[PDB]
Symmetry: D2
Subunit: 390 residues, 4 copies
């Protein structure tokens, strides 16, 4: 009766459509993505085609209704993220950005003109987007951003000056969703396009996490943005923070995919690998580790399902997402690390993949809110007292 | 939108009946049990009346259909356990025994005569029962039990000899469900009654955990048991192990009640207690602890709900129960310990209750399968390889 | 070559005198203290005689030179604390107070008259002292104390008003060293004596930690203190904090005694206790725990030795003591908890002693600076930035 | 008085020579090694010159007396390892191999001819050596090695067949110390030299740990070894295990260097980096982490000193080394991981170095005995019962 691959029977909680979506995508991930990841991660190569392929599959911005989007459930989105990360976090990162940080904001805060113009191309993967929020001196604290947008009443345009750093996709992006503080004090979102004079996106080197993902900066040297390129629905941090919650939800699901991959790899290895005349799996010390991995993965999976259902009922609060994002990323990191220890020397070889996941989850536990920041977010909600600053 | 008392909205997952049952019982627990626990735990006093009271409420053996039992869902049973333990583990222990270790076996493995005869009295709390499995040299390993039952073909009866130890309720029990190895090699269950010649149940002293619970031994000096007092439905360890899973399920839910109590107490204390001119809740170190407690409690609550639903569909496997029992008891223990540290000096006073829960959860994490035994149970299920012995 | 009872050979680091002192005291502790601890802890009984006995042995205020004191090394003091706590923390607490919190301050900040008058009696155990610093609203933050001392220029005396709580020895104390804020803003130390009008010391009930220790309050209802009873060498928090470091040093050593006791008990139990046809010690899960316990104990022992040597050279800084106090108390707590889990059901019985140590170490990790406060103390020293307040 | 860079004043425990040695080497490491590590690690480049340079400095095989070796203390050796690893584990690995796994065995188990012939060249870095013990199917269990050596009575030589894997330095080694099982059942050590027919040493690719170190295999296709190339002092596992303890001792010290580097980097970063209008160092959550790092580093440093002193007195047992190797490597890993989390996004860049140490320590915690194997080694010593196998 017990199936270690699905202890609490998540399967019977999914709809036929969700199950169908998951399996279909899984096939694509295993057939087209797994075979390119080894060298991609080793030589820091991101295949632009990947976005086009996922575009044809209609996986980009799946929860969006209309504009060429699937219009599927939040749970389906979570299931998609899990299958992508089961392969690699870098790949899932590229998809999170396109879906939740680029398409979503244009959909929720954009004008109908902007939706009509960008969504269809983004959905089909014709345009690669990026989300510019973080800056050299503004990470956990967005109120410290220095990127400014000055209004030109005569030209009915804005002039942007600033630097965004650690931006996923920027080096090969076509559309840039940038957040800058305005003269009125409010921070707004601007749509920039490659080619605009004064806009640069150099690549960041020396990464030892999310190597199969393109990461760069966004340097704006007096970039002039037409008024029509401004997002009319966002005013102050609420716009970005809102988008952030959608990306974080996808992340809470995704890391479970990476964990499951690590669990499966460690398990099979423990059964195949022999020392002292028996398989490693025969040892108590080894079995306890496997039990811990399965336990944490399971608790996170069913919690994510619940959040996904609440989300579709418009009953999901940002704190809920922080709770699972923080929990799953932290737990996922520990799992990948244990798995690495379990494969011994072979574990430091990327040929065995676990080392790649352990490295990748390092970055995942940091971006979209650090583990400690999310704790403080929960702390504020629990006590009603803010403790970020002094 | 966010309610820290129910982060993922468990409430909307419960039926009106379940909610009604929970609240009704909660009222009883807060009005009748909380007021007696301070001194009960301090002076090791178990109020026999408690079983009668719960009997009138019809909370005893709630999942049983007929025989004067409520016939409620597994989730309802879990909800009941949670409210009882929110008060004290010792109290919930007395109820777990009566319901899952005494009534359940008589219901599933007993003859119709035994059901008709015992269930109604047990349901109303007229009879206090106990479950005798563990022995001085047989704890984590039941195959080592030395209690033997010899058959008397002439009298059509059995003669039992042995010692059961660390038995909840034994000192004031009326009915004893004892497990002994038979001459044929199979271990069977026998129903003994206070008064039988050769049967003794002395109390155990020096307990510093579950003090409000009566704990003793069961000494059998050639006790003669009529054949009709044997449970015809059990043959070898499967009978007790089966019952054990039902008790463990209730335990997985219960410890969450104790955790929630500790969380609420620590939280309120952090808000009321002031040092350095501000409430303790203002400190980052304090807020992280609260965030961790809420996180673990939440993951366990929704996992338990899922298990409860599967259980009512007859799709629950023993491994599922081990996973949650091990997880929730371990996590609950850490939570009570953190809470104790958070109340400082006052935390070692039973007047603040947290110290009582921390002590109680010590025993809970040990009985009904130790934390490590459950890991091995999961390990066997995951690898297909047994690692209990060498 | 390897001796698990002393992995890094601490023995060859001790002087013949230190070794002699340790063994002599050990004999007393095992012969006179161990036999009374079971019931003492169970019924909350502190034997006043214990202080007289240690007085005859000359163990009280051992580092003090003259006044009938041994005048031994700091390491000897640490060794003494370790042997006392190997028996019980409550007992070591009574000795820490007498030696470091009562005798030391009178020795360092007192007038020659006060030394001549009190030290000899305290050294011989004729007088039982206590240290009154903590108050209901002043624990981790001493600047919040409300006990005030008003000067009476005419009578050349002070009038004290306030309440000290959670004070070790107060219910049966003869001498009270109380700290109160003065009209000039500075906090001074006053010597009070039982019998003074307005002075009350009721006992605290409901303790589930350090039960063999007498703990009470110090209520001062307009107590008049002669000027000669004021400690001329202390002015503001430096006096108490200075004394505190001496007590904390003894604590860092002591908890290692309790840990060693828990390690030895768990080890022997694992060898004697059999399940699954072999001793528990045969299991990998069990052996890892023992390895962890030995490792932490060893690291702490040699660190304490080093601190002790520096101390005698007047090169010990308060931060050094915080580091070891915080480390050893935290680690000791984990060790006792693991040991308790290792003895299973029997572990919750005080007959097996481990449960007593686990409970006791709860209080030890809280008093003389909480685990988190000491972290902040280290944090300030490392960064040069204070983070206690906001 | 308190200096966070040396809490317990290790400095006053070192001799003038040891201090002189440390500082002299430190200068070399910071001036010649630090500047090459960034790209070395990034592009997997090991500079052969490094061994020549350390050879001129006389740091190779420092504890050896004569043969052109320094003949310094064990503590000096530890101090050297700490300064090397403060730069990079890969670099220290190359030195550990040359000193403890190549020079030491030739010194202790070799013939005078072999010493005269190899030591002088190894000491000056003229020859690069490697230690071949591990095989594809023989890691934690050496008794499973398949490399065999057949004796040729006629030629008075041996023929070796087998494969060694994960061997540090092999791809550019001149001398190979290989261990093979003989026909008599005993395993002996053979000295091979590059150029011998049938000997191959291909490089291993895909490493994501110790990248600045050359790692390869040793394939022996019927390699013929003269009798004079056999180590006359080793017979069965004792030879390699003996050498292993010397390398492990150096490792226990070394990882503390990497930890200190991570602590210093995280600390400075916390002081320079600002968010929410204050330096990160102002936050409680940040300060606790720093306190933990300093605590563990300190406990390990003084324990290592003690072991080093015992070693020079020939009183060091293998278990002592396991205890510190296991402890320091495990703790060092946690420290590097925390530091990485503390630098946020920048932490995944090798430009900030912490990510390199975290990756490197992964391998260090695995080789020379895994964390769990060392636990079992301690477990056997503590209980007298072996638990490696079943
Ligand atoms: C691979 C990768 C891809 C990324 N892609 C994008 C992208 O597409 N778009 C984008 O906008 N950003 C992106 N980012 C950046 C991510 O959003 C930011 O890295 C994160 O928000 C940045 O904070 P920080 O790195 O400056 O960390 P900081 O937090 O400033 O500093 C690091 C440490 O400080 C701690 N800390 C901070 N404040 C406090 C406090 N008040 N109390 C206690 N502890 C505190 C943190 O928890 C952490 O441990 C990416 C980052 C990475 C690594
Ligand atoms: C308050 C209380 C009430 C109880 N009430 C009842 C009752 O009503 N009815 C009843 O039948 N029993 C009862 N029990 C007993 C409980 O069921 C048993 O205590 C538990 O099953 C007993 O095992 P043990 O205590 O002997 O532990 P043991 O496991 O024998 O030993 C303790 C340690 O050994 C470890 N260990 C054991 N085997 C292995 C292995 N193969 N590998 C690795 N580690 C191992 C355990 O995990 C544990 O840490 C009660 C116990 C308590 C404390
Ligand atoms: C058995 C026993 C015997 C004692 N004997 C004596 C005695 O003889 N003499 C005496 O003077 N005292 C004595 N004490 C009291 C001890 O000195 C005090 O209990 C301790 O200093 C009191 O602080 P608190 O209990 O109020 O804790 P509080 O710290 O006020 O509150 C508890 C929690 O708040 C946390 N906290 C507090 N401030 C901060 C902050 N700024 N940031 C983050 N976290 C914070 C603490 O770390 C802790 O977890 C005794 C206590 C006990 C339990
Ligand atoms: C960078 C690097 C450099 C190296 N350089 C050298 C060198 O120069 N010379 C050399 O000889 N070797 C070298 N090695 C290899 C090192 O000595 C071996 O990797 C280690 O001994 C190999 O064991 P394994 O990798 O097969 O692990 P295995 O232990 O076989 O398997 C991995 C896991 O199994 C666990 N495990 C194994 N047995 C048990 C048991 N009985 N009970 C419970 N758990 C168990 C381990 O603890 C571990 O977590 C190097 C390795 C690396 C990564």
């Amino acid at each position: 009766e017990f199936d270690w691959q699905d202890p609490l029977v998540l399967e019977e909680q999914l709809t036929t459509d969700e199950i169908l979506i998951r399996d279909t995508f899984r096939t694509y991930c295993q057939e087209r993505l797994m075979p390119r990841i080894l060298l991609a991660n080793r030589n820091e190569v991101f295949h632009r085609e990947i976005i086009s392929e996922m575009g044809e599959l209609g996986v980009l911005g799946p929860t969006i209704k209309g504009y060429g989007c699937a219009g599927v459930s939040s749970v389906a989105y979570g299931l998609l993220a899990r299958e992508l990360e089961r392969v690699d976090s870098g790949y899932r990162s590229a998809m999170s950005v396109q879906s939740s940080l680029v398409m979503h904001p244009i959909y929720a805060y954009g004008s109908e003109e902007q939706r009509q113009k960008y969504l269809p191309q983004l959905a089909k993967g014709e345009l690669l987007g990026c989300f510019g929020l973080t800056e050299p001196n503004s990470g956990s604290d967005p109120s410290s951003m220095e990127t400014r947008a000055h209004y030109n009443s005569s030209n009915k345009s804005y002039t942007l000056n600033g630097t965004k750093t650690w931006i996923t996709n920027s080096p090969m992006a076509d559309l840039f969703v940038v957040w800058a503080r305005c003269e009125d004090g409010c921070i707004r979102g601007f749509l920039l396009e490659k080619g605009m004079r004064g806009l640069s996106a150099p690549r960041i080197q020396g990464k030892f996490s999310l190597r199969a993902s393109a990461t760069g900066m966004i340097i704006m040297d007096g970039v002039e943005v037409p008024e029509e390129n401004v997002l009319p629905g966002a005013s102050s941090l609420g716009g970005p923070f809102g988008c952030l919650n959608n990306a974080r939800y996808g992340i809470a699901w995704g890391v479970l995919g990476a964990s499951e991959f690590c669990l499966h790899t460690a398990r099979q290895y423990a059964l195949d690998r022999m020392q002292f005349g028996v398989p490693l799996a025969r040892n108590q010390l080894i079995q306890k580790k496997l039990a811990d991995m399965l336990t944490e993965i399971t608790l996170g999976l069913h919690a994510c399902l619940q959040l996904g259902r609440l989300k579709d009922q418009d009953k999901a609060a940002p704190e809920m997402v922080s709770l699972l994002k923080r929990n799953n990323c932290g737990k996922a990191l520990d799992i990948a690390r244990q798995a690495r220890d379990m494969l011994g020397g072979n574990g430091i070889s990327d040929e065995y993949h676990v080392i790649r996941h352990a490295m990748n989850l390092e970055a995942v536990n940091t971006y979209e809110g650090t583990h400690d920041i999310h704790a403080l977010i929960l702390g504020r909600a629990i006590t009603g007292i803010q403790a970020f600053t002094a």
